Ligand binder design. Structure first.
Ligand SMILES: CCCOc1cc([C@]2(C)CNC(=O)O2)ccc1OC
Ligand SMILES: [Mg+2]
Ligand SMILES: [Zn+2]
Length: 338
């Protein structure tokens, strides 16, 4: 409507407010934002994707996110997709990616948490869930999000990639699988170590645009971009970030209650009777989010300085509400329990 079009004026900006978009699109923010993004980048035209087919696919995908899960619902997918859309346009990456690579990253972002049950991989492993048995304890959720997303493409009434070439579909699938598997937090430290090595050997044109030799380097940047998007809540305005924190803590605490009910050990940051919300965000920023974004900022300097400055301000706010490599691994364990 009127308010929706006003909010969508910020489609290409980090300050877009996805909560507002959700409110004005009958709780279909993913459908909404993906249609706005694809139209903005001319992807429907480029890849001969019919609008009806695209909407049907996106609505079905959206409906496969659980509305009763506090954080990992379709609003988080919409946020990651829109954040990825903004990251693909950072000046340091101008003309670096093919249309297929752009399509793959945004698609990956959209499907990356589909059918998430609101409990972690480790909870699924420890309770001997059907999903963990299916996936042999390895990136259980992420393998599942991919399987759902790709399973939905089988059916003409939903095959948005019908008009890509066979080679194109194969390359896209390879790329998307790579990106979604990279959202598994248990791989955070390795992704970061690999991204630091990339910053070290960074090469540019005389214009300040990154030079990426072949597929290996391109997919490495894209994996990290989606991971950054997934870890982007603390880099947004404080008003937005605080809502994301309320949501993750509601989801985590519900997992902790489930753990308590079943007599399992309570994961510390999922224990509502002990965990400090504020300290947890400070630690999340210090040992996970800032190290990653500091490295991303190095890769694309100076394009991400504003984000780094917002990150610092947000950290100081959470710290004010409280009355290195070793702790990097510690916080990765607290989240994953791996
Ligand atoms: C509570 C400390 C961790 O906080 C967050 C974690 C996460 C993710 C990346 C999602 N699940 C999780 O384990 O880490 C997202 C947002 C968070 O805060 C807004
Ligand atoms: Mg995930
Ligand atoms: Zn996610």
């Amino acid at each position: 409507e009127d308010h929706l079009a006003k909010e969508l004026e910020d489609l290409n900006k980090w300050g877009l407010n996805i909560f507002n978009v959700a409110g004005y699109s009958h709780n279909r923010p993913l459908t909404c934002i993906m249609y706005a993004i694809f139209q903005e980048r001319d992807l429907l035209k480029t890849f001969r994707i019919s609008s009806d087919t695209f909407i049907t696919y996106m609505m079905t995908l959206e409906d496969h996110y659980h509305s009763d899960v506090a954080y990992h619902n379709s609003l988080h997918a919409a946020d990651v997709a829109q954040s990825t859309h903004v990251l693909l346009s950072t000046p340091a990456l101008d003309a670096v990616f093919t249309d297929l690579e752009i399509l793959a990253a945004i698609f990956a972002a959209a499907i990356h948490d589909v059918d998430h049950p609101g409990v972690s991989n480790q909870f699924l492993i420890n309770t001997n869930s059907e999903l963990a048995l299916m996936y042999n304890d390895e990136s259980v959720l992420e393998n599942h999000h991919l399987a759902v997303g790709f399973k939905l493409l089988q059916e003409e009434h939903c095959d948005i990639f019908m008009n890509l070439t066979k080679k194109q579909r194969q390359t896209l699938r390879k790329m998307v699988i790579d990106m979604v598997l990279a959202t598994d937090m248990s791989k955070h430290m390795s992704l970061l170590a690999d991204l630091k090595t990339m910053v070290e050997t960074k090469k540019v044109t005389s214009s300040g645009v990154l030079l990426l030799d072949n597929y290996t380097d391109r997919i490495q940047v894209l994996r990290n971009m989606v991971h950054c998007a997934d870890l982007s809540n603390p880099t947004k305005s404080l008003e937005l970030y605080r809502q994301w924190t309320d949501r993750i803590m509601e989801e985590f605490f519900q997992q902790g209650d489930k753990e308590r009910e079943r007599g399992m050990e309570i994961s510390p940051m999922c224990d509502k009777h002990t965990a400090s919300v504020e300290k947890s965000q400070v630690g999340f920023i210090d040992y996970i989010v800032h190290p990653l974004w500091e490295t991303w900022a190095d890769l694309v300097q100076p394009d991400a300085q504003d984000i780094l400055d917002t990150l610092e301000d947000n950290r100081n706010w959470y710290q004010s509400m409280i009355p290195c490599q070793g702790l990097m691994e510690k916080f990765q364990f607290e989240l994953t329990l791996d």
